[PDB]
Amino acid sequence: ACSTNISPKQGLDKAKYFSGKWYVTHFLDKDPQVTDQYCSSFTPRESDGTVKEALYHYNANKKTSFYNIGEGKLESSGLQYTAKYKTVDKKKAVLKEADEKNSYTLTVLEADDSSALVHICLREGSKDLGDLYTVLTHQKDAEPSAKVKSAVTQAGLQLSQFVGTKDLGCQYDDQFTSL
Numbered sequence: 001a002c003s004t005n006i007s008p009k010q011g012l013d014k015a016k017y018f019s020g021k022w023y024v025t026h027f028l029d030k031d032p033q034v035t036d037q038y039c040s041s042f043t044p045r046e047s048d049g050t051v052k053e054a055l056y057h058y059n060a061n062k063k064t065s066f067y068n069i070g071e072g073k074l075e076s077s078g079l080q081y082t083a084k085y086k087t088v089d090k091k092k093a094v095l096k097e098a099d100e101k102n103s104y105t106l107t108v109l110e111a112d113d114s115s116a117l118v119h120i121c122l123r124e125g126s127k128d129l130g131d132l133y134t135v136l137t138h139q140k141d142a143e144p145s146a147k148v149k150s151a152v153t154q155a156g157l158q159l160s161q162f163v164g165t166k167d168l169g170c171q172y173d174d175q176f177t178s179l
C-alpha cells in the first residue's frame, strides 16, 4: 500500500510549485500495476485553496496518451492535496466526470525555480496503488537541481533506481500544458 508517513517539505513557498509546467525526468514506481513505461507532464495551479491541474500521460511502449484534470483542496498543513480527476481530451473537453471512488494524493517534497520532487498515491479502485515518486523539471529533458537530487536521498531513495524518461522516445502535448 502507499506510505501514510509522507509529509510535505516544511516552509516551501507554494509559488515555486504552482508555476509553469512540469515534465517528469525520473520516476520510481514502488509497486507498478502495469509494465509499460510512461512519460508525463502537467500544469498545477491553485486558487482559493483548490488545486486544479492539467495532466498528460504518454505510454512510451504502446504510443498511447491520455489527459486528465485533477481537482482537490490544498491541505492547510502544507503542500499536499488529495484530488479527484476527470478524463478530458486534448482541448480540455470533459470525456468523463470524476469517479468519486478514485483519487490521488500529491505531496510536494521539494521545489525550486527549476525542479521539484513529488510523491503521488493514486487510488484507482478502492486500493492504494503504491507509491510513485517523480522528479520534475520545468524544461523537457533538463537536469534536476542539486537541491531536488538531495530530496530524493532524503526521502530514503536512490536516484540510481529511478527510471529516466530522457531516452524513452517521449512525445508531449505542450499545447495542452500551456492551456
Ligand code: HEM
Residues within 6 Å of the ligand: 024, 026, 027, 029, 034, 037, 038, 039, 040, 042, 055, 057, 066, 068, 085, 086, 087, 104, 106, 120, 122, 124, 134
Ligand atoms: C512518469 C510519471 C508517471 C508514471 C510512470 C505514471 C504511471 C501511470 C500509469 C501506469 C497509469 C495507469 C494507466 C492505465 O490506465 O493503464 C497512470 C494513471 C494515472 N496517473 Fe500517472 N503516472 C505518472 C505521472 C503522474 C502524475 C504526475 C500524476 C498526477 C499529478 C498522475 C496521476 C494519474 C492519474 C490521475 C491516473 C488515472 C488516469 C485515468 O484513469 O483516467 N500520474 N499513471
Ligand SMILES: [N]
Residues within 6 Å of the ligand: 120, 122, 132
Ligand atoms: N500515476
